[PDB]
RNA sequence: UAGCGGCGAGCGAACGGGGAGCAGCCCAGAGCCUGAAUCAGUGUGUGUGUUAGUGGAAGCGUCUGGAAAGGCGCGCGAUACAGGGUGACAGCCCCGUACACAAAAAUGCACAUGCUGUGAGCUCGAUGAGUAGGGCGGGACACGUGGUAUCCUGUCUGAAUAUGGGGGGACCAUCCUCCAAGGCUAAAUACUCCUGACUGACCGAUAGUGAACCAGUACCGUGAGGGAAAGGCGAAAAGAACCCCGGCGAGGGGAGUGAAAAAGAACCUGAAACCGUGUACGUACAAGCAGUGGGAGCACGCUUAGGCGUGUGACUGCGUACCUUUUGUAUAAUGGGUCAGCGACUUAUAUUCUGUAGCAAGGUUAACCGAAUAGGGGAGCCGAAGGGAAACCGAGUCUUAACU
């Protein structure tokens, strides 16, 4: 469709299918959950009765005592040693089909356009690597929680936005569904949009 | 607070045979 | 680890188009003089596995 | 909108939790009944066990044998027959076309239908259906 | 993600102990015993919700019978007259009338006797 | 999968394909040419790293409070809002971080340049014998002696040598391929006692290492060995001068410090079992899972002066705990002295079915590459065509000489 600009009011051409498709709630949710799971590292491990320090000696003989039958001090029902099902270090990453991942991005991009959370502008650069310049260039635009998605990574822009936490700068390649949804506004560049069109296809 | 270590052998039971 | 198919079963059943299994009748190996020709003729062709034992078979060889 | 995403209805079941309370339904061994082998931890009988009776896969005789030639042969659908390279079909480049496999040495053509462009097959076997199909289309057969 | 159950356990135990308040000895101090009392108390309450209706029914019948005998008629005969006379006053009211308004109850039997005759 | 297997339980490749990483040489010898490369052992110089470090921006006023970093108002820095501390939560109070710099001396690595030692290249020749192989007995090979190739070995034997020999799964012939019985060789891979940095849908004192407190200590055992318990005052000791009772005590009461002393070192919070004191009611002629339904009186609170709430409960109907195991339990069947804490359907990898989502006669990638949850990678797997033991046939196929 046509993407209205706010500064040049220059027409932009974008494939209807990849920016006007319905919003697949179920597909987007599954991708977001998958992305969150992939972020984990599963760095957790416990010790079962086998791995607990101690010995296999029976604390007392197995009959005649007026006490319950015990086999070792490492039993899970015993203090200081146990854990019936000790955790192991495991990966929580989930496979997501390439088409499913691409389909989700198209749905999110379509939704953002509909909710006018996506703004297309011309080149967005800073003459010097100073955070003030970036802050001023956003205050006049009335943007507080924005994702500066640029066609090419620029060191001056990258350094300027590094300190700011509500402002994040990324390349088209470095985009994830979670970041796109989380950030209140996303401002693209003409080149960034063009490269998004082709690699989405 | 050590639990009793030495438990004596039980007294032999009366022969019910 | 992947499931281990029972080798004995794999040598006695084959998958068919509709998921059934065919086998050979278990009475045509030896002691054949006393067996009637009619009985031997009927046992020669392969037979489909019954439903009752189908559950056991599919468990034994889940890869075929 | 991260706090608005929800899954499709029926996508989750929450799983079944065993031995947690009375009203959870399946408590008290969690739906594995009273004493037995099934009730014990790690219990159960191996596959095909019939309570000591001779298993079916042991009662029935073994028969037949494996043919190695069958492993190195494949059947080519008439549909994909025209998808190899333009309108020429040959033993070579089928592996490149990736429709038979590198190891497959022999090859046969089967009637799959939906063939329009004429094709030529060299060294293949085209029994009756595909032979009529390609001949009507305008193909040819040669050895 | 270790989960501690100290907070939940006390909440459940207090809730049972609150319902078991007033019981004797360990039945109001010990959870292991108070739980039995609360459950057993629940059964009796469920049972008594039905026994109460029949206990009051028989209490009313006794009151009506006493009033009928005092005034010169059996309870069985008295109920016949009301049924024959088509009076839909229940046992609860008849017992209520007999205790409070003697004159009213006298009127009841006179028609009951008239209906029988 | 093929195979091996009381063909049981089980074990389970190769060929080939896709990736990581790449490197080939010497002796069994003489001559010609002679530092002729590549290496190893040691100097000098260059670069960088390691062992101490240095600078490092930017806030005030009011309200509550014991004290603000908090609320309210107006500012400032940011290639520094990663963290920690500071009398409650700090980008701007402190230590730091981003960033830019620094090594007299001792060392790692990568280069250049010297010394010492071993050594190119060319020609011709040679080309690993008690070995291969075999008999007997064992082992390794996925392959248990089976038709059993191949390798290794204890024992007894024993070739050819390039017109020669080995292998190609009994074996033979024809072909193809390679040259054993002498050696060296980086990288791709495995592990972490130890040091640094960072991370955690990991634990938070019965957890986490046995050990958060001078723990592998006390303690137990002849010994090998076993093996605990025990964290927390406050912002700051300001840790209670002094007075009184008491035995120049313990302990306590005042005073005093503090926001707080039922924060007093037996110290944050302070639950339950358990043990007491006070108040209200009931109880010394009444029998039993101790409750529940009905219910008088009494003592406290309400609005109204009629009752409702709370506590108690005379008297009365009914009523023999819970769990487990059983055809069946109040059972005199099992289990529990009570409280608090902990304690039992999990995880990985495959397969089948159901739900849901994507794509659709197509679907999907694994390892790996990747400034990298993207994108590449389609090797491979599953499916659309089955029948037969198989050759083979093919919307048919097998059975049969052939099928109504």
Verbal overview:
A three-stranded antiparallel β-sheet of chain C has the order 1-2-3, with no helix packed on it. Chain C contains three helices and three strands, in the order H-E-E-H-E-H. Chain C has helices spanning 7-10, 37-43, 51-60; strands at residues 14-15, 21-23, 47-48. Chain C starts with 6 loop residues before the first helix and ends with a helix. Chain C has one domain (1-64). Chain D is low in regular secondary structure. Chain D has one domain. The termini of chain D are far apart. Chain E has one domain. In chain E, helix 3 (75-85) packs across helix 5 (102-116). The chains are: A alpha/beta (201), B little secondary structure (17), C alpha+beta (64), D little secondary structure (143), E mainly alpha (117). Chain C binds chain D through residues 6, 8-9, 11-13, 23-26, 28-29, 53, 56-57, 59-60, and chain D through 47-48, 50, 55-64. The structure holds one RNA strand of 404 nucleotides. Chain A: Residues 44-71 are annotated as: Disordered.
- Number of DSSP strands of chain B? 0
How many helical stretches of chain B?
A: 0
Helix content of chain D: 10-25%
Strand content of chain D is 5-15%
Largest sheet of chain D: 3 strands, parallel
Q: What's the total number of strands of chain D?
A: 5
Question: Quick one: biggest sheet of chain B?
Answer: none
Overall morphology of chain B? rod-shaped
Give the termini separation of chain B.
42 Å
PDB class: ribosome
Keywords: ribosome, antimicrobial peptide, RNA, ribosomal protein, PrAMP, proline-rich peptide, antibiotics, 50S, Api137
Entry title: Escherichia coli 50S subunit in complex with the antimicrobial peptide Api137
Chain A: Large ribosomal subunit protein uL4
SSE inventory with pairings:
This is part of a larger assembly, with chains A (201 residues), B (17 residues), C (64 residues), D (143 residues) and E (117 residues).
Chain A: H1 16-20, H2 25-39, H3 98-114, E1 118-121, H4 131-139, E2 146-150, H5 155-163, E3 167-171, H6 177-182, E4 185-189, H7 190-200
Parallel strand pairs in A: 1-4, 2-3, 2-4
Helix pairs in contact in A: 4-5
Chain B: no helix or strand
Chain C: H1 7-10, E1 14-15, E2 21-23, H2 37-43, E3 47-48, H3 51-60
Antiparallel strand pairs in C: 1-2, 2-3
Chain A binds one RNA strand of 404 nucleotides through helix 2, helix 3, helix 4 and helix 5.
GO molecular function (chain D): rRNA binding; structural constituent of ribosome
Subunit structure (chain D): Part of the 50S ribosomal subunit. Contacts the 5S rRNA.
Biased composition (Gly residues) (chain D): 20-30
Task: Please provide a brief summary of the model.
Chain A is an alpha/beta fold and 201 residues long.
Task: List its traits.
part of a larger assembly; 5 chains; B: about 15 residues; little secondary structure; about 0% strand; D: about 140 residues; 3-stranded parallel sheet; two-stranded parallel sheet; 4 helices; RNA-binding; Ribosomal_protein_bL20_C (chain E); rRNA-binding (chain E); RNA-binding (chain E); mRNA binding (chain E)
């Amino acid at each position: 469709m046509e993407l209205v600009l706010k500064d040049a009011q220059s027409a932009l051409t974008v494939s209807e299918t990849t920016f006007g498709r319905d919003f697949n709630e179920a597909l987007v949710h599954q991708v977001v959950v998958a992305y969150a799971a992939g972020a984990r590292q599963g760095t957790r491990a416990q010790k079962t009765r086998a791995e607990v320090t101690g010995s296999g000696k029976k604390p007392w003989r197995q009959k005649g005592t007026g006490r319950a039958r015990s086999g070792s001090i490492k039993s899970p029902i015993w203090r200081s040693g146990g854990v019936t099902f000790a955790a192991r270090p495991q990966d929580h990453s989930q496979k997501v089909n390439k088409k499913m991942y691409r389909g989700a991005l198209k749905s999110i991009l379509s939704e953002l356009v509909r909710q006018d959370r996506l703004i297309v502008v011309e080149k967005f650069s800073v003459e010097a690597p100073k955070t003030k310049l970036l802050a001023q260039k956003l205050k006049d635009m009335a943007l507080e929680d924005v994702l500066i998605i640029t066609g090419e990574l620029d060191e001056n822009l990258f350094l300027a936005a590094r300190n700011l936490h509500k402002v994040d700068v990324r390349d088209a390649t470095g985009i994830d569904p979670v970041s796109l949804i989380a950030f209140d506004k996303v401002v693209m560049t003409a080149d960034a949009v063009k490269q998004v069109e082709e690699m989405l296809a | 607070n050590n639990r009793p270590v030495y438990i004596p052998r039980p007294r032999p039971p009366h022969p019910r045979l | 680890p992947k499931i281990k198919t029972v080798r004995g079963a794999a040598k006695r059943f084959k998958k068919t188009g509709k998921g059934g299994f065919k086998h050979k009748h278990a009475n045509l190996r030896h002691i054949l003089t006393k067996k009637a020709t009619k009985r031997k003729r009927h046992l020669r062709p392969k037979a489909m596995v019954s439903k009752g034992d189908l559950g056991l078979v599919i468990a034994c060889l889940p890869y075929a | 909108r991260l706090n608005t995403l929800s899954p499709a209805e029926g996508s989750k079941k929450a799983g079944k939790r065993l031995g947690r309370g009375i009203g959870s339904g399946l408590g008290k061994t969690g739906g594995r009944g009273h004493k037995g082998q099934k009730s014990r931890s790690g219990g159960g009988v191996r596959r095909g066990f019939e309570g000591g009776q001779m298993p079916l896969y042991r009662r029935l005789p073994k028969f037949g044998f494996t043919s190695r030639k069958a492993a190195i042969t494949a059947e080519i659908r008439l549909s994909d027959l025209a998808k190899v390279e333009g309108g020429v079909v040959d033993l070579n480049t089928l592996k490149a076309a990736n429709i038979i496999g590198i190891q497959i040495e022999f090859a046969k053509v089967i009637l799959a239908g939906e063939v329009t462009t004429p094709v030529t097959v060299r060294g293949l076997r085209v029994t009756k259906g595909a032979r009529a199909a390609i001949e009507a289309a305008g193909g040819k057969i040669e050895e | 993600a270790r989960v501690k159950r100290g907070v939940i356990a006390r909440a459940r135990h207090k809730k049972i102990l609150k319902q078991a308040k007033g019981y004797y000895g360990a039945r109001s101090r010990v959870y292991r015993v108070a739980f039995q009392a609360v459950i057993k108390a629940g059964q009796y309450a469920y049972r008594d919700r039905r026994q109460r209706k029949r206990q009051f029914r028989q209490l009313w019948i006794a009151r009506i019978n006493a009033a009928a005998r005092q005034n010169g008629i059996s309870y069985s005969k008295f109920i016949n007259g009301l049924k024959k006379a088509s009076v839909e006053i229940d046992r609860k009211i008849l017992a209520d009338i007999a205790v409070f308004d003697k004159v009213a109850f006298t009127a009841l039997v006179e028609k009951a006797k008239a209906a029988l005759a």
